[PDB]
Each structure stands twice: as C-alpha cells, then as structure tokens.
C-alpha cells in the first residue's frame, strides 16, 4: 500500500453502490462502519440502492451525484475525514437481484459540526478499484497511516 500513490496521484472517479448514511460521531473507525452497516440491515432506512459516482483523492474523498435520483453531491476533504474502512466485520450487502457486495464506510466530520462525524455507508462496485484496497490506501495516504 506504499506504492498506492498511483490512485491519489491520479484521483480516480469511479462508481460505487450508494446505500445510506449513519451517525458514528461517538464510534471509532471500524465500529463506525459496524453501526452504519448493521443499522442499514436491521432498520433498513433505504430500500433499493443505486450506483453513484465516487472520487478518491489524497486531498479528500468526494461523492458525486451521477443521476441525482436519491441524494448525492459531494463528500469530505482530508480536513474532515477521520477514518475509512471497507467493512466492520467483513459484512456484505444483498442486492434485490440476489448478488452480494461488500459494504464500506467513510468517517468524516460534517461542515459546521467539527465535534461530530458521520459514516456514509456505500457498497462496493467497479471491479477496477477493489473496495478492500481503496479505503485501505486512502486511510494510509489521507491521514498518513502509511507504514
């Protein structure tokens, strides 16, 4: 993941599976994705998911409203991001079609509220950029967690 510069030096704008957003201000890194994922299953705030745009950059992460059907716009820069994970305990999302995909979540502070952070839950998509790798290098290059 040290040679992950290839992704940040480029700034890939890929497509991801949008699920839902959950508050994780009191949670930690992985636990954030946990409450976010579990709540999305137990409570199910969102019924049918959709494929939206996602941009990975070392200056911050950005969400993109490709179709603007549910609710998308942008994400949070490095000054707001606190953590990123591909899954809490290696859980997957079951699409209405029956196929299962990983569920990753990003922990970032919302503008105006630096004391709190929210974890936006998004399922994996775009086989060119592995979800279990994208957030992994992101955490390392964004926060400087790189070994």
């Amino acid at each position: 993941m040290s040679t992950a510069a290839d992704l940040l030096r480029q700034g890939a704008a890929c497509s991801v599976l949008y699920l839902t957003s959950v508050e994780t201000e009191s949670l930690t890194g992985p636990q954030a994705v946990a409450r976010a994922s579990s709540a999305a299953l137990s409570c199910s705030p969102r019924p049918t998911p959709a494929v939206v745009h996602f941009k990975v950059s070392a200056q911050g992460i950005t969400l993109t409203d490709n179709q603007r059907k549910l609710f998308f716009r942008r994400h949070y820069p490095v000054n707001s991001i606190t953590f990123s994970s591909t899954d809490p305990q290696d859980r997957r999302w079951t699409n209405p079609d029956g196929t299962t995909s990983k569920i990753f979540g990003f922990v970032a502070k919302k503008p105006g509220s630096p004391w709190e952070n929210v974890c936006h839950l998004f399922a994996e998509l775009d086989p060119d950029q592995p979800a279990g790798a994208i957030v992994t290098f992101i955490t390392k290059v964004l926060l400087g967690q790189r070994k």
Binding site: L8, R9, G11, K55, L142
Partner: peptide, 14 residues
Amino acid sequence: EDHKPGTFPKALTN
C-alpha cells in the same frame, strides 16, 4: 468498471 480513472485532484500524497 474496468479502466482506472484519474482526473480530479492535483496528484497528492498525504
């Protein structure tokens, strides 16, 4: 999908 993109930032690294 298949091709890896890279058009948005200014080539950063932490």
